[PDB]
Symmetry: C2
Subunit: 371 residues, 2 copies
């Protein structure tokens, strides 16, 4: 479910140090993925405030409902002896957060997931508008530790084993939803503790990035986009797309697809410490430009992945962030032809000291499933 | 899945009028339950901004990723011809929100679910710190329309049918989790389109409000707290708790439980237009005080319910909101004895012109299941 307490003790210290280096009095983390990362808590109260208050200096405090007290034994909080301030319905828990930071006025950063419901009254209680914690917690969470790389690698190998099972699911007459049920079951069977998402976009639906699956039946000649992932304990994601053709594709489809393959490969080959996120997006986008296809490449090249399917860093135009070793993100260019077909090639890669490691290794060619 | 477009046209106009009456330039609704209520959208992009921009005056605008364009046909947005501003990865969509409101500086309110990720850059783009939309949208969403009352009533009758099936699940030796699987299946069978939550707190776990279910086996003498709900199309919740005893309880348990029953009944009897939320909480809390039990009543008396299990109004100490007809909330006092047992009696009620209608009607007595 979670890492040893020592892992969290070390994340908490590193987070406090970076908060101090950013000149803030502290961080305020309500439930979600930053909390899970910082103390291993899967708590989520919703309208009732639970928050980890991590001062730049001194002992952290957990503010939470008294009725939730037993949740402390679940995460690392109890073992580390963080201060607890439980409150009862009728209390203003925002005042407890202020006090745990030394009292208003206090300059803080908040987890980017904190809802307005809490953020706006927190701002009043603190006397200072919070800034996003993303610049602070980024330095930690986007640089994966050895054990996190390992979990992503095992999730990647597992999702690869699912993609190997996909061609036998792709039979004319079967609906996208029957394929998706077969895939969901295989996601679990191959070792993920849960299904994250299943996308099976056949024929025209492959051109539609919002599409999940439906009752459309596979036809001979369909290009089928398959984008799938699961979680691997203690909660890291796989996320890989491969495109299949039901019977031989046409020459035009084959040629444009192979430009996409070159684009994807070239973005993967550009991954090194020191190159910018925007340079990696440029590497895919330039090849597709040169083949005359850039207008059909309607999204960013990739997103970070870890405890969430989508996180820092973003491999997108305008992102000047230099890449460093241990960053994990997708490389997933695609081309989309509204009403006709689409294709996407997606790997998760991990930055190494002199390049990248792909944790997804299925063939990159368009797989031709016989009819 | 959703209401006729006319229902949303009317919610949008009423929301605009209240926004103007509050002196704001407009509302900004990112994905979640306010969006579902306002235009019937189940969209959720996450780190990419989707927002309904509802000016105090003039046509609303949807700001969303170009890659999500097809989602517009899913909700009422396309039928009502709202303006669309799609944007591409690399763009700052917060600038589009500002412009749709006439440009910075713009004073707005935001859905209480909006995450910091969007709220903090939105605040900069708008030139003015947003306030919570809860005071505006409250006037709409906490007053249920006839069709919403109907959906809650059908969900309530369905969850009652589940509670009727619960005694036969409660057999010594069976684990809480096996009971919970039986309940989850019955939730669907009785007509809910999905399970919302299943709580089976037996023996000591009944004293623990954070508890869901576990591998603890039911024992003779256990008091079992059962708190369960599902959704009913187009997405309204049931939420009802009843307490069971495995074989006759002891005289002390029986006596204290009947004080809880009186407390619950007295909060239900106090529900009328014009009484305050805090007076309704007082009605339950005073009876439990008088029996000497108030210190074991460790939470608010109830919460609003509708498209979410937890919403406005909150039936809690300090809430001065006068109740009006069509409000829907739980009445759910409980008493908790750490390490020993707990009990909770929970109904959803709807305020009527001269009182309340309960949509949950299972017996309020402690049900004694034979061993
Ligand atoms: Zn809640
Ligand atoms: Zn302390
Ligand atoms: Zn974050
Ligand atoms: Zn279709
Ligand atoms: Zn979508
Ligand atoms: Zn991806
Ligand atoms: Zn993907
Ligand atoms: Zn290859
Ligand atoms: Zn190859
Ligand atoms: Zn996302
Ligand atoms: Zn327009
Ligand atoms: Zn709301
Ligand atoms: Zn236990
Ligand atoms: Zn809880
Ligand atoms: Zn409830
Ligand atoms: Zn309940
Ligand atoms: Zn009764
Ligand atoms: Zn009775």
């Amino acid at each position: 479910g979670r890492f040893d307490t020592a892992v969290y003790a070390r994340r908490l210290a590193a987070a406090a140090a970076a908060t101090e280096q950013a000149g803030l009095a502290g961080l305020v983390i309500t439930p979600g993925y930053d909390l899970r990362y910082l103390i291993g808590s899967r708590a989520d109260t919703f309208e009732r405030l639970t928050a980890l208050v991590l001062p730049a200096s001194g002992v952290p405090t957990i503010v939470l409902p008294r009725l939730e007290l037993a949740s402390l034994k679940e995460s690392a909080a109890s073992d580390l002896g963080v201060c607890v301030r439980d409150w009862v319905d009728g209390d203003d828990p925002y005042q407890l957060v202020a006090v745990a930071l030394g009292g208003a006025p206090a300059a803080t950063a908040v987890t980017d997931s904190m809802p307005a419901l809490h953020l706006l009254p927190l701002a009043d209680a603190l006397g200072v508008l919070p800034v996003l914690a993303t610049d602070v917690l980024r330095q930690l969470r986007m640089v994966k530790e050895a054990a996190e790389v390992d979990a992503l690698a095992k999730a990647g190998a597992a999702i690869d084993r699912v993609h190997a099972r996909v061609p036998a699911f792709l039979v004319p007459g079967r609906t996208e939803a029957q394929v998706a049920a077969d895939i969901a079951e295989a996601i679990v069977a191959e070792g993920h503790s849960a299904v994250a998402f299943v996308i099976v976009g056949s024929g025209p639906h492959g051109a539609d990035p919002h599409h999940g699956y439906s009752d459309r039946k596979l036809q001979v000649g369909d290009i089928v986009v398959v984008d799938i992932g699961g979680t691997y304990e203690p909660g890291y994601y796989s996320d890989s797309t491969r495109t299949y053709s039901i019977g031989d594709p046409s020459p035009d489809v084959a040629q444009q697809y192979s430009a996409l393959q070159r684009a994807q490969r070239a973005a993967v080959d550009a991954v090194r410490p020191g190159v910018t996120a925007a340079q990696v997006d440029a590497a895919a986008r330039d090849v597709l430009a040169d083949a005359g296809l850039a207008e059909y490449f309607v999204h960013r090249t990739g997103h970070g992945i870890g405890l969430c399917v989508h996180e820092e860093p973003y491999i997108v135009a305008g992102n000047e962030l230099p890449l460093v070793a241990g960053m994990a993100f997708s490389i997933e260019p695609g081309i989309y032809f509204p009403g006709r077909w689409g294709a996407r090639i997606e790997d998760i890669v991990v930055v190494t000291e002199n390049g990248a490691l792909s944790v997804n290794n299925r063939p990159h060619e368009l797989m031709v499933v016989p009819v």
